[PDB]
Enzyme design. Structure first.
Site, mmCIF file in Angstrom:
data_model
loop_
_atom_site.group_PDB
_atom_site.id
_atom_site.type_symbol
_atom_site.label_atom_id
_atom_site.label_comp_id
_atom_site.label_asym_id
_atom_site.label_seq_id
_atom_site.Cartn_x
_atom_site.Cartn_y
_atom_site.Cartn_z
ATOM 1 N N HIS A 133 40.672 40.681 50.106
ATOM 2 C CA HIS A 133 39.440 40.012 49.684
ATOM 3 C C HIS A 133 38.466 39.782 50.833
ATOM 4 O O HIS A 133 37.362 39.284 50.635
ATOM 5 C CB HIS A 133 39.724 38.695 48.945
ATOM 6 C CG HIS A 133 39.972 37.521 49.834
ATOM 7 N ND1 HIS A 133 41.238 37.088 50.163
ATOM 8 C CD2 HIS A 133 39.116 36.636 50.403
ATOM 9 C CE1 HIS A 133 41.154 35.986 50.887
ATOM 10 N NE2 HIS A 133 39.875 35.692 51.045
ATOM 11 N N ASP A 187 46.830 41.105 47.786
ATOM 12 C CA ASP A 187 45.651 40.859 48.607
ATOM 13 C C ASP A 187 45.949 41.338 50.027
ATOM 14 O O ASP A 187 46.212 40.548 50.930
ATOM 15 C CB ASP A 187 45.320 39.366 48.612
ATOM 16 C CG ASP A 187 43.997 39.074 49.262
ATOM 17 O OD1 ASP A 187 43.256 40.037 49.549
ATOM 18 O OD2 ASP A 187 43.688 37.882 49.472
ATOM 19 N N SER A 195 41.653 33.524 55.842
ATOM 20 C CA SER A 195 42.179 34.684 55.130
ATOM 21 C C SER A 195 42.305 35.893 56.047
ATOM 22 O O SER A 195 41.459 36.124 56.909
ATOM 23 C CB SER A 195 41.285 35.029 53.944
ATOM 24 O OG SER A 195 41.466 34.078 52.914
#
Ligand code: 0G6
Ligand code: NAG
Ligand code: ZN
Ligand code: ZN
Lengths: 251, 44
Positions: free
Chosen positions: A43, A99, A199
């Site tokens: 992402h 992800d 992330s």
């Protein structure tokens, strides 16, 4: 990284920063697993809702960087990207299942005392270290709270792996076997969590078999940051190693 | 360590992995490293 502490110089030499070229902008964390390959969160490169669909030359990367404002000479490195690889089954519309993403540096980086690759786990190490209760380590330049804002120095925090039944009950999101959550329970007296901006960052564990650090996960998601009864979610690196393999041999 | 990747595809270091030059390489433990270790010792 909320409720963490500054990182010692060189305690995370595989730390990589995902930068956006124009405008200059810190996007996500990432990790060095080779002299040419970097791991990160899918992402971070592709997420339509947030107008995210970057390409090879939209981004750049920085390695061995210690602070976030001063350029550090023959310490930090700035590498362009030759190619980007997102898992073909990455579910960005639903639960961020799978992800994960790979990035190939346009030009390999020379290892130093501030720059080295982290290990990817094998069958034995994976099943041996990925056990609830066991603590891992997460690093990142992300927010210190839910938006001080973000740090001027790399942040680090150790968190325990949480049992699937508990993770599943803490969120209304469809949790899959390709992810795991970590964090302290309200009854443990300790805090800490990854947060927005983290992330792509690695979740690493130290193996007592050979004294080496293995990246077990990738910071992926959470609801808020360091909120009681909540846990951060990380992409399970081993369950996706066949894919990492395919992509790399293919390139 | 033992290998998964092919050096020519992969690069170097599948084998220089996971060992910090300023810590493991110099036989020095980092400030919070032990917390991880101790988590391997169940609820002793
Ligand atoms: C893109 C990252 O920086 C960030 C990491 C969050 C880590 N948080 C904690 N507490 N450890 N990821 C995100 O913000 C992702 C991208 C999509 C939205 N998102 C979320 O985590 C949402 N807050 C929750 C969610 C939405 C959709 C699918 C899964 C989770
Ligand atoms: C990414 O942008 C390319 C156009 O440049 C587009 O073909 C591709 O469908 C985008 N990926 C999506 C939106 O999932
Ligand atoms: Zn420095
Ligand atoms: Zn701690």
């Amino acid at each position: 990284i909320v409720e963490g502490s500054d990182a010692e110089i060189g305690m995370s030499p595989w730390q990589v920063m995902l930068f956006r070229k124009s405008p200059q902008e810190l996007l996500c964390g990432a990790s060095l697993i080779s002299d040419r390959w970097v791991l990160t969160a899918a992402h971070c490169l592709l997420y339509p809702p947030w107008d995210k669909n970057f390409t090879e030359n939209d981004l750049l990367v920085r390695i061995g960087k210690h602070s976030r404002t001063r350029y550090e000479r023959n310490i930090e490195k700035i590498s362009m990207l030759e190619k980007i690889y997102i898992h073909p089954r990455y579910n960005w519309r639903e639960n961020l299942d799978r992800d994960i993403a790979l990035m190939k540096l346009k030009k390999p980086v020379a290892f130093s005392d501030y720059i080295h690759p982290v290990c990817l786990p094998d069958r034995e190490t994976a099943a041996s270290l990925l056990q609830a209760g066991y603590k891992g380590r997460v690093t990142g330049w992300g927010n210190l709270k839910e938006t001080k804002g973000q740090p001027s120095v790399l942040q680090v925090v150790n968190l325990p792996i949480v049992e699937r039944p508990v993770c599943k009950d803490s969120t209304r999101i469809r949790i899959t076997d390709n992810m795991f959550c970590a964090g302290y329970k309200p009854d443990e007296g300790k805090r800490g969590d990854a947060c927005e901006g983290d992330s792509g960052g690695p979740f690493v564990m130290k193996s007592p078999f050979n004294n080496r650090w293995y990246q077990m996960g990738i910071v992926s998601a959470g609801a808020g940051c360091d909120r009681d009864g909540k846990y951060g979610f990380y992409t399970h690196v081993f369950r996706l190693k066949k894919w990492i393999q395919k992509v790399i041999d293919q390139f | 360590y033992q290998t998964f990747f092919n050096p020519r595809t992969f690069g170097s270091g599948e084998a220089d992995c996971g060992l910090r030059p300023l810590f493991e390489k110099k036989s020095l433990e980092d400030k919070t490293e032990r917390e991880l270790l101790e988590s391997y010792i169940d609820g002793r």
